[PDB]
């Protein structure tokens, strides 16, 4: 029996591996892959948890197609995303 | 006798402290006022070693006046600012 | 107010030369600056790439031991410096930065010498008259994750920034043009073709390294 808070923590936890995996170069892997689907899917960009990545994130073209540099870097946090998923609230 | 390369490595670590300091709140104090006269001063904001502050410190405007949020959120580093007065390269 | 490079140069077999991008506008302290290679009658050639960051370089194969990157931040400046240098370096050198968002090339640098992902580009070559529509397609080999950008290139000039990412029309661009795609096929519609608009239509994609271009498509009047 898998818990509502234990499976939002993990989705947060493999989110935190991909991004912090992706920014680490300009290389197309599968963790870009990854990020670019969490951020098109939830509408969201990095995480408040790990804000030391923002500027990265912002380097390797990794927030959602349409919106500026602005709106990306004040972009909806992920890991709020995941938890309005796992809740259903959205 | 003060070496070159320990004053430098003091006034980036006196800034960090002023940085760390001045994130916390909206609260007008010396950090502030410290933080905002460095930024003015070498014409810089915030530091790449402390990215994880770079979002509080355009949330609580202590980057130079007349640059937008673009212009500053890619501001020249204050530890490199710190690093040519010491060298005499500006 | 963006990319400024360095002037021509005219050179002979056995050469070394150095040619420079100086940024103002972009955060070239930390950001890409890459390299591409247009060899006259010829294609878009990607030749390599520095990550200012950690100072990092890649090359592609061919370039690996004579082209060499170096940057001088202060300044914001990228150098490309190219050595044992051959007819087939007789080429414009463009200088590309990328990363928080997509960018305009700079105008290009001549040197003349005298003594992995696939982009299918469809069609080759349009005969159109001004007022039709028109619609060029590109395809990746791979999923690019709409990392793609649509150019016009004019006889003799550096290729124009149409569309940036899959969709958005590049600042000062006119509303007649629109980007659409996504995973593999993407497309170029220009709608009510004008006469300031022929010459060669290029995509790209940016998802990772090497950078590829597709083959071209030529609008001409007939």
């Known amino acids: 029996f898998v818990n509502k808070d234990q499976i939002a923590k993990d989705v947060k936890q493999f989110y935190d591996q991909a991004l912090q995996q992706a920014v680490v170069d300009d290389d197309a892997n599968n963790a870009k892959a990854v990020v670019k689907t969490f951020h098109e899917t939830l509408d969201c960009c990095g995480s408040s948890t790990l804000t030391a990545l923002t500027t990265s994130v912002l380097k390797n073209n990794l927030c959602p197609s349409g919106s500026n540099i602005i709106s990306n870097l004040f972009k909806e946090d992920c890991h709020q995303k995941i938890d309005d998923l796992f809740s259903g609230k959205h | 006798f003060v070496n070159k390369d320990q004053i430098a490595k003091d006034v980036k670590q006196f800034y960090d402290q002023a940085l760390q300091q001045a994130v916390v709140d909206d609260d007008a104090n010396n950090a502030k006022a410290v933080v905002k006269t460095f930024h003015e001063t070498l014409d810089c904001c915030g530091s790449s070693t402390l990215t994880a502050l770079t979002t509080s410190v355009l949330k609580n405007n202590l980057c130079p006046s007349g640059s937008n949020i673009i212009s500053n959120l890619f501001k020249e580093d204050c530890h490199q600012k710190i690093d040519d007065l010491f060298s005499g390269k500006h | 107010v963006r990319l400024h490079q360095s002037a021509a140069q005219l050179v002979q077999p056995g050469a070394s030369v150095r040619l420079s991008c100086t940024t103002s506008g972009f955060n070239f302290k930390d950001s890409y600056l890459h390299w591409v290679k247009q060899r006259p009658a010829q294609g878009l050639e990607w030749i390599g790439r520095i990550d200012t960051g950690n100072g990092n370089v890649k090359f592609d194969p061919k370039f690996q031991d004579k082209a060499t990157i170096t940057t001088d931040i202060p300044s914001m400046t990228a150098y490309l410096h190219l050595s044992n240098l051959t007819s087939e370096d007789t080429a414009v050198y463009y200088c590309?930065?990328?990363?928080?968002?997509?960018?305009?090339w700079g105008d290009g640098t001549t040197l003349t010498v005298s003594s992995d992902i696939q982009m299918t580009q469809s069609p080759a070559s349009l005969s159109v008259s001004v007022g039709e529509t028109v619609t060029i397609t590109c395809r990746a080999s791979e999923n690019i994750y709409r990392t793609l950008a649509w150019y016009l290139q004019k006889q003799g000039k550096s290729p124009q920034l149409l569309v940036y990412?899959?969709?958005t029309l590049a600042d000062g661009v006119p509303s007649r043009f629109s980007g659409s795609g996504s995973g593999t096929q993407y497309y170029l519609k220009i709608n009510s073709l004008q006469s300031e608009d022929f010459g060669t239509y290029h995509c790209?994609?940016?998802?990772?390294?090497?950078?590829?271009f597709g083959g071209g498509t030529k609008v001409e009047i007939k």
């Open positions: 590309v930065p990328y990363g928080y968002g997509f960018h305009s």
């Open positions: 790209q994609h940016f998802w990772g390294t090497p950078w590829t």
């Open positions: 990412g899959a969709t």
